[PDB]
Structure 1
Amino acid sequence: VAYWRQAGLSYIRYSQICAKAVRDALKTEFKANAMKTSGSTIKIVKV
């Protein structure tokens, strides 16, 4: 946590920016799949 609790970020956030950045990166066919596998697809809907 240099900023993963010290400028916010969690390991979750930090990491998630990483993966996200990996998704940001990566080649596109894979990036399609991004949003699938491990691409956050939470629907934050209380019920």
Structure 2
Amino acid sequence: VAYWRQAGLSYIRYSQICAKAVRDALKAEFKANAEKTSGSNVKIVKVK
């Protein structure tokens, strides 16, 4: 249990933020490999 627990979060929602900070501390050379993974392409369709 931590602060991300007992407030209504998930471990993916933990793992998204702490991995995003590593992609901001990279240099200009290895910024394209942070652009490579960047997995925001799946759309969301719920019928209601």
RMSD value over aligned CA atoms? 2.6
Alpha-carbon distance change, 2 to 25 in structure 1, aligned in 2, over 3 angstroms: same
Give identity over the alignment, percent: 91
Alpha-carbon distance change, 30 to 2 in structure 1, aligned in 2, over 3 angstroms: same
TM-score normalised by the chain length of structure 1? 0.55
| Bigger Rg, which one | 2
Aligned residues: 47
TM-score normalised by the chain length of structure 2? 0.54
Unaligned ranges ≥5, structure 1: none
Unaligned ranges ≥5, structure 2: none
Name whichever structure is richer in helix by fraction.
Answer: 1
